Design an enzyme around this catalytic site. Structure first.
Site, mmCIF file in Angstrom:
data_model
loop_
_atom_site.group_PDB
_atom_site.id
_atom_site.type_symbol
_atom_site.label_atom_id
_atom_site.label_comp_id
_atom_site.label_asym_id
_atom_site.label_seq_id
_atom_site.Cartn_x
_atom_site.Cartn_y
_atom_site.Cartn_z
ATOM 1 N N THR A 27 0.816 -1.207 0.000
ATOM 2 C CA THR A 27 0.000 0.000 0.000
ATOM 3 C C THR A 27 0.852 1.260 0.000
ATOM 4 O O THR A 27 0.358 2.342 -0.329
ATOM 5 C CB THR A 27 -0.939 0.013 1.208
ATOM 6 O OG1 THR A 27 -1.736 1.201 1.179
ATOM 7 C CG2 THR A 27 -0.145 -0.018 2.497
ATOM 8 N N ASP B 172 3.043 -11.647 5.997
ATOM 9 C CA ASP B 172 3.803 -10.431 5.733
ATOM 10 C C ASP B 172 5.010 -10.325 6.655
ATOM 11 O O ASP B 172 6.041 -9.763 6.273
ATOM 12 C CB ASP B 172 2.907 -9.202 5.879
ATOM 13 C CG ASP B 172 2.005 -8.989 4.678
ATOM 14 O OD1 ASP B 172 1.825 -9.938 3.886
ATOM 15 O OD2 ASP B 172 1.480 -7.867 4.520
#
Ligand SMILES: Nc1ncnc2c1ncn2[C@@H]1O[C@H](COP(=O)(O)OP(=O)(O)O)[C@@H](O)[C@H]1O
Ligand SMILES: Nc1ncnc2c1ncn2[C@@H]1O[C@H](COP(=O)(O)OP(=O)(O)O)[C@@H](O)[C@H]1O
Ligand SMILES: [Mg+2]
Ligand SMILES: [Mg+2]
Ligand SMILES: [Mg+2]
Ligand SMILES: [Mg+2]
Lengths: 269, 528, 523, 100, 389, 99, 50
Positions: free
Chosen positions: E35, E338
């Site tokens: 992002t 992640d």
């Protein structure tokens, strides 16, 4: 000469079965009143395999019509070629399963089925010698599938050495017309594996790819439904258990295997 | 609350939930109260197909009236769970629940919690059951007593000219199949109905009646002495399980194979013929073969040359009725055939009624599985009689399995009413309102009987209650004069287990109904 | 022309969503809060098939409701997480979660970031666990009169409480039988072997626990016996009949005797199988498949009783109560797999239906529960209550710890956190006392449901806990007065309390981290 | 013919020539066997064969077909005969005597 | 996370779909920062519109952008920190915990950080001694709702989402001999080209008996070497499940192929698809089995699973996640993936840079004085890159 | 105007399309009317001076007959009370045959 | 019908067997002295040229 009988169950089975008799009555020249006004000799050498003659020249069929709802019986009676059926061969209930495979299998299918075996006996008594049965049902609705699965199991037991063919229907490929369609289908296929001789699907003895697509999509929805245990209390609460559904998916996976089509750590071995 | 989450929901909060259960309970009782006693009226039931069903039994009526309610489905299932256990007391079940909810509403409407009434039902249910133990009378249950018990349950579902005929056929049948030990086993009294003649010809046959005869026109129709061979072997042409097939040659080898495929089935027939020729050397006895599997036309021509009357495709239940009746052994194979496995009858004759065929087995030595023959001129008449026959058979099995009988005519409901009044002060708190309300619901059986005969509902109760304080006699209500009559010296008798189950059932359902808070329908409209 | 970017996707964001998620959670709690405590009332539902589900259980009510709001769907799922983990406490977990989520909007409207409230909720959850383990009191398993009091305090709320002297001995004598150790030190109490059978009729006082298994089946042949004293049952899995193979086999016949010779071998195959069973001298044969008519002829000669088509699961519990193992090929039949652990086999009739009873077992490890009552609706609620009584008993054996009930535990932890928050400082103090004061909803619903002043009884209980030794004082749910739980005898397992406090905090944490909804994207 | 699925198997040229003649000569004896008993009229209830019709006309025999089952049974009572389930000559008691 | 929101959305503007496929590239090449890269890319276009709407040619912006990107990477290598100078076990907990912030498990970072580091060091593969290799997506992450998220456990071995076949088998074997198979133990049958034609009825029973005898001999060859646990990717017939009952052995059917590869590697066993050898016979030697030290079938929230602990050949790891419901657990798995990729890059590339906006604020300074030495229309383009960062 | 509501009880729980006729003025006096109409249809064909009747069923088949039982067989009847009178006549045909 | 030959020598004799069956029927007609032939069943072209 190896006379055969027919059994029609459920709402879907009656509608197709009512039109099935249409192609035989007109081909053999059987009048709507039951009489005969044909003008060929080839329409009479095989008239006894499907029709039982009566006194005076009446030819009645050999079908049994069963259902859990009385509202689907008068449609065939008042329709075309509906007067020729035997009045005693109508078997109806009062409650209905309501898309419930298990309600129509043990809790309420256990009473009306005893009213069907006594009917198939009196028809099989009149025939000289029979070779098999023909049954028609569905796989999505629990009213027919649950009742048919029990009915198809109580036919083989009394006649272990007789063939039996089915003309079942199968659910739509992409769309689904019922919420619990995958639940009602997996529990019915595995009961047709070792209880049938030839089955047909209308949209290793399954006829109509190599049917591999039909069984692949059903188990994909079923596994996703069973992981969350959604809508499971409707079946377990009336007499089922968790292990019963496990055997359905384990057996379903075996049939797919018989229908064969034909990670970042790879350094040393 | 729910209307905010699901707009297409139907809910009934606060007292709107109690107003729906009370209203429907009283709706089913205003229709079911005309069926009580021998003076009730007959009802007509017409379905969508166009058939006619005249019934009086509360179970058959409830499952045939077009009713769609949630709270009218709970009562319907309670009556079903009584018909298959006790077989009697389906009309009195609906009346008591409908009235027990009516009495409890008079105190709830006066600003009283429904839980206070609940504690009163528990205390009143324990006293009523302790009072019933001392009212029942333990007897020997001889023939003369079972006539009176069976007549009470048959005079309310037929007229007097039929109940006097059906009482003798039910009492006799139970006695004939009962041993000195073991519970009475049903499924051994076949109920055969033939649509001919009048309804007063319903008789009891000491034997078996089969709804099929012989399929050859050269078979005997009357044997005066026969051996019954009950078998479950197949005489039809059968094919090998593994896929086979003939591979012949010039046309002479085709003839050597057609009569070589019939040896396996013609060997079974030749075992029966030698057995018949051994035990019956002279043409003075018969030999009847009853099979559960089919017989080829070829095997009906070999057996008919020796006068072997053979019937095919009998029902599985008749393999057990034919051994108790005759006395043979029902065998599956023919490798051990012996004369010790043959039955014995005294008269086997054929009856043809239009397009249907019947076979009679009579004059058995020591029969243990009798059959009932039902005759009537109408289709619905044979169904009305078949309901009474089931009712009268479970009223005799209950009277034998329990060595005690309770008097009827409502003389016992009055007795709990007086006993619970003197027990009211002994209960502390507001729970005395439960006992007073319970004693008022039990008095509906005398009220309905007094109202269905055309008397006064109130002037009759005061006369019945005028007795039983001044004389310790179980006095009931007469149905012709309205005068108090003693039910124990006339013939009116009930079952101890029927009244015991009724008290247990009518309290559990009406206790859960009174505690219902709201009626919520937030699920899917239909399973689709 | 008609151009778009996200294809009619409905997006909402901002503070509007946060107030929409909290009000959706509080509505779920508003439906259930009247079904807590011994004075709870009853509801009925209407399923799409046509039946009626009348119950008091907190999970059996919310699982039938169809709600379209995503924030409400999370409160339906945590109900069954409690159900599948501990069994009890499906109602207290929904009321508590609503109160823990209602006291949060007061801080969100005071310009406080939602991540600040998260750290306060997780900090206080590590203090709730330490306080509960301080007031835990151990129990003795060998004490039988104490194990009846724990179960009695759990079914004193359901519709079984009228017969609490009967259901206490049913749910205790079943868990003690299932407990079993096969290999190693693995101790399991599995409720798959506690079959519950419902039969409409009779009276509830006839409900008993048999010492074996009960099957709904009958004898294949009427000439077979129906009463055996000490049976030697053998269990099978294969079918006793001639079937086909799978290797594409065909037969070609060209002589006159090859047709009848083939038919004769089908009868010699069956005799070979039967003589492998009569060699071991069974008394009863149980199979999960069909039996031919010829195979029944050879079994009445040796006085053997056979049952055809028994379910897989019913055929597994028999091996656990008689002692045997499932054999498929009858050739590999030994003496160690013949069942000699039974003592009776009779076949009765219960309302025009035959039933198979296998009772009087030496040391059974599986049982069946026979329920009798009035209708199918009444027996359904008895089964839901009994499944609650056995899951409480199983938890005690795996964790013999108890804590006071009736509301004494909620005030005990509420007191501990209010005296610990006055030693901290900063902006984390205010959401630290809302989490402690939100627990007083459990003893506040117990006063409203019975009928009493909830503003005088609550303040008489808060001041009651200020003393040093009052951790067991709760509120009586039947009269409406403060009584000690040492004499009343209300107790609950520690495993139930630890799961109610842990699940509720995470539901509040998860729903406080949403700030926009993207409705509609077609997968 | 057999009810099980049967087929011929010709492996030599010599057996192929004699097969057609074998079936025809087999049928001549069966029809002539009935004709020697004096049976002038043969009544059947099934399908008549083309080769079987040829030999029926050769020996001055009358062939009538009635495909109505029960109508056949009524004839057995009128003439005093018995229905033969197999194609074999009747002996003495299975021959019905009419007058015209 | 940006890779999952953008992937599930239906986007059909061609200029917007390029950003959606860009996010999917970051998740595969790196695994983190999905992002952060979309915001920079969309800001760079916005700063370039103000120039193109003026009389600045679009090719002058592109040339300036390529220059700024080139020099911004060289400066970062001046701003580098090598982890080995600081504490090895303090430069991995902090680097893994930073990726744990802004997730559901943010507060529980100090608990989850130790688990992630202890799960990467266990699967450290040995190369030809040029560089250690740390494979990822080799640990099994299993979701199971239940107790709090502080109840998640790290298994010192492997965990299977499977159940034992028949209820008669034992559920706990101390010293187990793993025998990994890759073929179905069902009754044999003939192939498509082989049929059975019988001309003599007497030779029928022997043929039918030989269909159930071929598979019996194969199982006996396996159990004679001391095998305790049998793992099969195919299906096992119910007749073949009885031979493991009296033998006191476990048999697990329908095991995934990706799971069998890791079990065989970690225990030393060999995956064989047939019993043949260099000669015409079929044999099964005893030098190709596995060795664990506790194979116990645990129960977790109703449904069961099979753990395999203390594998001696190598070390393996697996993580079992405990949450409130199915929505909460699915977000703990994605936020743990992640974190695993962040630790792998630090161990492989021994260099880290400060977080919290310290790089972009430093790059917007160096690029501002660098553009002052161009003196062309590329001056404007470079200054816009400094403001866009 | 105002509308008369439905009386509480059994009348409010009936399914749509069903009917309920209870009492002496609604069930007994109406049953006699249906059966009295049936007697006036078959009376004309009584005795030697009876008259034939042209009946056509729903298969467009024509019947010219004077039997009482044959007329009732080819006439459909939708009244339950008049249906018992028909089945009473069909029973004498199978026992006696005339009458 | 079905034919199962093993060797090519028996293959050629089969092909000559069908041509000899047909020619046997035609010769029998021609020897009888007939001049006109009629038949319900079809007449092939080989018989027409005969
Ligand atoms: N001849 C009779 N005289 C007086 N009371 C009777 C008579 N027969 C039956 N009863 C009473 O009528 C009540 C109900 O009987 P009935 O309506 O026939 O069946 P159910 O018991 O199912 O309602 C019984 O309690 C019985 O006491
Ligand atoms: N006799 C009693 N007096 C006061 N409180 C009680 C009593 N019995 C049960 N409770 C309380 O009721 C609560 C549980 O209510 P219930 O709805 O039956 O189960 P749950 O909500 O745990 O699923 C417990 O917290 C317990 O303290
Ligand atoms: Mg009665
Ligand atoms: Mg509880
Ligand atoms: Mg990151
Ligand atoms: Mg006349």
């Amino acid at each position: 000469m190896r006379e055969i009988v027919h059994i029609q169950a459920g709402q879907c089975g009656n509608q197709i079965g009512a039109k099935f008799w249409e192609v035989i009555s007109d081909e053999h020249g059987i009048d709507p009143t039951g009489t005969y006004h044909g003008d060929s000799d080839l329409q009479l050498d095989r008239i006894s395999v499907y029709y039982n003659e009566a006194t005076g020249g009446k030819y009645v069929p050999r079908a049994i019509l069963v259902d859990l709802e009385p509202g689907t019986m008068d449609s065939v009676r008042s329709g075309p070629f509906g007067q020729i059926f035997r009045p005693d061969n109508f078997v109806f209930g009062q409650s209905g399963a309501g898309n419930n495979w298990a309600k129509g299998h043990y809790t309420e299918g256990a009473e009306l089925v005893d009213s069907v075996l006594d009917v198939v006996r009196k028809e099989a008594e009149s025939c000289d010698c029979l070779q098999g049965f023909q049954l028609t049902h569905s796989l999505g609705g629990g009213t027919g599938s649950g009742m048919g699965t029990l009915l198809i199991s109580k036919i083989r037991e009394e006649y272990p050495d007789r063939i039996m063919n089915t003309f079942s229907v199968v659910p739509s490929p992409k769309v689904s017309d019922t919420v619990v369609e995958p639940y009602n289908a997996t529990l019915s296929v595995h009961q047709l594996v070792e209880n049938t001789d030839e089955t047909y699907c209308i949209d290793l003895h399954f006829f109509m790819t190599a049917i591999q697509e039909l069984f692949k999509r059903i188990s994909e929805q079923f596994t996703a439904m069973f992981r969350r245990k959604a809508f499971l209390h409707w079946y377990t609460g009336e007499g089922m258990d968790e292990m019963e559904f496990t055997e359905a998916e384990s057996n379903m996976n075996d049939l797919v295997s018989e229908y064969q089509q034909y990670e970042e750590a790879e350094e040393e071995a | 609350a729910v209307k905010t989450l699901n707009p297409k929901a139907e809910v009934a909060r606060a007292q709107a939930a109690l107003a729906v259960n009370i209203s429907a309970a009283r709706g089913l009782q205003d229709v079911l109260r005309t069926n009580l006693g021998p003076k009730g009226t007959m009802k007509m039931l017409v379905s969508g197909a166009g058939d006619i069903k005249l019934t009086k039994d509360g179970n058959v009526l409830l499952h045939e009236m077009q009713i769609q309610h949630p709270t009218a489905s709970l009562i319907a299932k309670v009556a079903t769970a009584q018909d298959d256990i006790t077989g009697d007391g389906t009309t009195s079940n609906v009346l008591i629940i409908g009235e027990l909810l009516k009495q409890a509403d008079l105190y709830i409407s006066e600003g009283l919690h429904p839980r206070i009434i609940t504690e009163g039902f528990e205390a009143a249910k324990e006293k009523a059951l302790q009072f019933l133990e001392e009212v029942k009378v333990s007897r020997e249950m001889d023939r003369e007593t079972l006539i009176d018990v069976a007549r009470t349950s048959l005079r309310t579902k037929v007229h007097a000219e039929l109940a006097d005929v059906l009482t003798e056929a039910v009492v006799d049948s139970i006695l004939a199949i009962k041993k000195q030990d073991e519970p009475i086993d049903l499924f051994m009294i076949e109920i055969m109905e033939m649509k001919h003649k009048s309804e007063t010809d319903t008789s009891l046959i000491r034997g078996l009646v089969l709804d099929h005869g012989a399929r050859h026109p050269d078979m005997k129709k009357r044997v005066e002495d026969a051996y019954i061979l009950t078998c479950n072997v197949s005489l039809e042409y059968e094919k090998t399980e593994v896929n086979s097939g003939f591979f012949y040659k010039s046309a002479e080898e085709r003839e050597k194979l057609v009569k070589a495929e019939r040896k396996f089935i013609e060997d079974r027939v030749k075992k029966i013929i030698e057995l018949k020729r051994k035990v019956c050397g002279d043409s003075d006895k018969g030999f009847v073969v009853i099979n559960q599997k089919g017989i080829d036309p070829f095997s009906l021509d070999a057996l008919s040359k020796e006068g072997i009357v053979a019937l095919r495709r009998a029902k599985r239940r008749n393999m057990e009725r034919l051994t108790l009746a005759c006395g043979g052994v029902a065998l599956n194979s023919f490798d051990d055939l012996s004369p010790d496995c043959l039955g014995h009858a005294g008269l086997v004759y054929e009856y043809t009624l239009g397009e249907e065929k019947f076979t009679f087995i009579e004059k058995c030595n020591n029969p243990r599985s009798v059959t009932l023959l039902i005759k009537g001129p109408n289709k619905h008449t044979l169904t009305q009689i078949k309901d009474a026959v089931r009712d009268g058979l479970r009223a005799v099995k209950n009277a034998i399995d329990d060595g005690c009988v309770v008097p009827g005519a409502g003389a016992v409901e009055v007795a709990m009413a007086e006993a619970l009044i003197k027990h009211k002060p002994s209960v502390k708190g507001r729970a005395q309102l439960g006992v007073q309300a319970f004693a008022d619901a039990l008095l509906i059986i005398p009220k309905v009987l007094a109202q269905n005969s055309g008397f006064d509902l109130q002037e009759t109760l005061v006369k019945i209650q005028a007795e039983h304080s001044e004389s310790g006699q179980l006095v009931g209500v007469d149905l012709n004069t309205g005068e108090p009559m003693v039910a124990a010296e006339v013939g009116v008798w009930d079952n101890y287990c029927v009244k015991k189950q009724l008290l247990h059932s009518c309290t559990v359902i009406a206790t859960n109904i009174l505690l219902v808070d709201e009626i919520m329908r937030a699920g899917m409209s239909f399973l689709k | 022309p008609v151009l778009v970017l996200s294809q009619n996707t409905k997006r909402e964001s901002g503070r509007k969503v946060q107030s929409g998620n909290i009000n959706a959670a509080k509505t779920i709690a508003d439906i259930i809060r009247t079904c807590l405590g011994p004075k709870s009332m009853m509801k009925m539902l209407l399923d799409p098939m046509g039946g009626i589900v009348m119950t008091n259980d907190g999970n059996a009510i919310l699982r039938e409701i169809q709600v379209q709001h995503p924030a409400a769907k999370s409160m339906i799922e945590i109900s069954r997480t409690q159900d599948e983990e501990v069994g009890d406490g499906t109602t207290s977990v929904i009321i508590l979660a609503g109160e823990m989520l209602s006291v949060a909007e007061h801080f969100l409207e005071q310009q406080m970031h939602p991540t600040v409230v998260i750290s306060a909720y997780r900090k206080a959850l590590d203090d709730m666990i330490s306080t509960l383990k301080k007031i835990s009191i151990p129990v003795d398993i060998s004490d039988s009169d104490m194990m009846l009091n724990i179960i009695n305090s759990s079914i004193t709320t359901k519709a079984i409480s009228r017969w609490s002297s009967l259901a206490c001995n049913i749910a205790l004598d079943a868990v003690k039988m299932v407990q079993f150790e096969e290999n190693g030190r693995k101790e399991i109490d599995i409720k798959k072997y506690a079959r519950v059978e419902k039969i409409p009729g009779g009276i509830i006082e006839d409900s008993c626990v048999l010492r074996g298994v009960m099957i709904n089946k009958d004898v294949t042949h009427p000439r077979m016996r129906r009463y055996i004293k000490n049976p030697r049952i053998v269990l099978l899995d294969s079918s006793l009949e001639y079937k086909k193979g799978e290797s594409q086999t065909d037969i070609e016949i060209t002589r006159e005797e090859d047709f009848t010779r083939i038919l004769q071998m089908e009868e010699e195959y069956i005799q070979q199988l039967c003589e492998d069973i009569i060699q071991l001298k069974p008394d009863v044969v149980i199979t999960e498949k069909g039996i031919s008519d010829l195979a029944q002829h050879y079994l009445m000669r040796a006085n053997i009783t056979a049952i055809r088509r028994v379910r897989k699961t019913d055929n597994n519990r028999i091996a656990r109560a008689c002692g045997a193992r499932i054999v498929s090929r009858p050739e590999e039949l030994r003496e160690d797999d013949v069942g000699t652990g039974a003592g009776l086999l009779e076949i009765k009739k219960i309302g025009d239906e035959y039933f198979t009873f296998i009772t009087d077992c030496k040391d059974p490890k599986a049982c069946t529960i026979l329920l009798r009552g009035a209708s199918k609706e009444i027996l359904s609620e008895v089964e839901r209550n009994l499944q609650d009584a056995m899951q409480v008993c199983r938890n005690v054996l795996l964790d013999p710890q108890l804590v006071p009930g009736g509301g004494a535990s909620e005030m005990a932890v509420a007191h501990a956190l209010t005296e610990k928050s006055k030693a901290m400082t900063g902006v984390e103090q205010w959401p630290y006392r809302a989490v402690a004061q939100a627990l007083e909803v459990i003893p506040r619903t117990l006063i409203q449901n019975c009928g009493a002043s909830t503003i005088r009884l609550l303040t008489s209980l808060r001041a009651k806990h200020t003393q040093e030794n009052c951790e067991t004082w709760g509120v009586n749910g039947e009269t409406g007065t403060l009584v000690d739980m040492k004499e009343l005898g209300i107790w609950e397992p520690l495993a139930v309390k630890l799961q109610t406090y842990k699940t509720a905090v995470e539901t509040a944490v998860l729903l406080l981290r949403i700030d926009d909804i993207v409705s509609g994207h077609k997968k | 013919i057999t009810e099980t699925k049967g087929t011929v198997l010709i492996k030599t040229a010599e057996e192929l020539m004699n097969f057609s003649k074998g079936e025809e000569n087999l049928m001549d004896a069966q029809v002539k066997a009935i004709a020697d008993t004096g049976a002038n009229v043969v009544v059947t209830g099934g399908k008549v064969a083309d080769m079987a019709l040829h030999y029926a006309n050769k020996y001055n025999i009358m062939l009538v077909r009635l495909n109505s089952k029960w109508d056949l049974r009524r004839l057995c009572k009128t003439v005093g005969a018995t229905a033969l389930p197999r194609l074999t000559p009747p002996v003495l008691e299975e021959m019905g005597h009419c007058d015209s | 996370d940006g890779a999952t929101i953008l992937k599930l959305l239906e986007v059909e503007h061609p200029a917007a779909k390029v950003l959606c496929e860009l996010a999917d590239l970051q998740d595969k090449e790196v695994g983190d920062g999905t992002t952060s890269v979309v915001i920079i890319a969309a800001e760079l276009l916005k700063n370039a519109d103000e120039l193109v709407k003026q009389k600045i040619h679009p090719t002058s912006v592109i040339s300036g952008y390529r220059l700024a990107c080139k020099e911004a990477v060289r400066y970062i290598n001046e701003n580098l920190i090598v982890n080995t100078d600081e504490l090895g076990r303090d430069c991995l907990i902090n680097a893994a915990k930073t990726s744990m912030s802004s997730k559901i498990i943010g507060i529980n970072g100090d608990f989850f950080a130790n688990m992630v580091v202890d799960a990467v060091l266990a699967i450290k593969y040995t190369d030809i001694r040029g560089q250690p290799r740390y494979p990822v997506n080799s640990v099994n992450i299993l979701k199971a709702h239940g107790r709090s998220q502080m109840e998640s456990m790290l298994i010192s071995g492997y965990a299977l989402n499977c159940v034992v076949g028949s209820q008669g088998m034992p559920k706990r074997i101390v010293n187990a001999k793993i025998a990994c198979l890759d073929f179905s133990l069902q009754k044999t049958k003939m192939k498509l080209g082989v049929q059975v034609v019988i001309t003599d009825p007497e030779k029928l029973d022997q043929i039918r008996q030989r269909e159930s005898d071929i598979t019996k001999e194969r199982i006996q060859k396996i159990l004679a070497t001391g095998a305790n646990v049998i793992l099969t990717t195919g299906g096992i017939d119910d007749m073949c499940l009885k031979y493991f009952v009296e033998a006191g052995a476990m048999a697990v059917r329908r095991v995934l192929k990706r799971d069998l590869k890791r079990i065989a590697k970690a225990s030393g066993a060999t995956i064989l698809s047939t019993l043949a050898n260099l000669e015409g016979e079929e044999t099964f030697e005893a030098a190709m089995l596995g060795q664990a030290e506790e194979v116990v079938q645990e129960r977790i929230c109703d449904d069961e699973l099979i753990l395999i602990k203390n594998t001696k050949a190598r070390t393996s790891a697996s993580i079992i996640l405990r949450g409130a419901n199915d929505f909460m657990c699915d977000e703990m798995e994605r936020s743990l993936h992640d974190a695993l990729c962040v630790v792998k890059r630090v161990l492989e590339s021994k260099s880290v840079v400060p977080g919290g906006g310290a790089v972009e604020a430093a790059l917007s300074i160096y690029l501002e004085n660098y553009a002052t030495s161009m003196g062309s229309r590329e001056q404007l383009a470079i200054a816009e890159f400094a403001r866009s960062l | 105007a105002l509308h008369v509501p439905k009386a509480p009880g059994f009348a409010q729980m009936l399914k749509e399309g069903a009917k309920h006729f209870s009492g002496l003025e609604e069930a007994v006096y109406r049953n006699i009317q249906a059966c009295k109409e049936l007697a006036q249809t078959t009376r004309t064909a009584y005795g030697p001076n009876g008259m034939n009747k042209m009946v056509i069923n729903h298969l467009e088949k024509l019947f010219v007959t004077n039997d009482a039982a044959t007329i009732l067989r080819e006439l459909e009847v939708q009244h339950p009370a008049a249906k018992m009178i028909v089945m009473a006549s069909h029973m004498q045909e199978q026992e006696v045959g005339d009458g | 019908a079905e034919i199962r030959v093993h060797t090519v020598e028996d293959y050629q004799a089969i092909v000559d067997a069908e041509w000899n069956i047909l020619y046997d029927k035609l010769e029998k007609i021609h020897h009888s002295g007939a001049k006109v032939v009629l038949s319900k069943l079809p007449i092939g072209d080989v018989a027409t040229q005969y």
